[PDB]
Amino acid sequence: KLHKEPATLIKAIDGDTVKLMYKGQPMTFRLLLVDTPETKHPKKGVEKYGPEASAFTKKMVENAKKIEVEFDKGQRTDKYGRGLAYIYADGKMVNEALVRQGLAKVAYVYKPNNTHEQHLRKSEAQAKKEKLNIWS
Is residue 82 among the annotated active site residues?
A: yes
Distance CA 67, CA 48 (A): 28
Ordered by where they begin, the domains of the chain are 1-136 (2.40.50.90)
CB contact set of 55 (below 8 Å; sequence gap of 6+): none
Distance, C-alpha 14 to centroid of its chain: 9
Buried b (16+ CB within 10 A) or exposed e, 71-87: bbeeeeeeeeebbbbbb
Distance CA 127, CA 31 (A): 19
Q: What residue numbers does the annotated binding site for Ca(2+) cover?
A: 16, 35-36
Query: Alpha-carbon torsion 11, 73, 88, 131, what sign?
Result: positive
Return the number of other C-beta atoms located less than 10 Å from residue 2's C-beta.
11
Distance CA 96, CA 121 (A): 9
Residue from 38, 52, 68, 96 carrying the catalytic annotation: 38
User: Dmax of the chain from CA atoms?
Assistant: 42
Is residue 100 among the annotated active site residues?
A: no
User: Experimentally, how was this structure solved?
Assistant: X-ray
Distances (CA, A) of 120 to 25, 35, 83, 107: 29, 12, 19, 10
Is residue 76 among the annotated active site residues?
A: no
Residue from 68, 82, 96, 124 carrying the catalytic annotation: 82
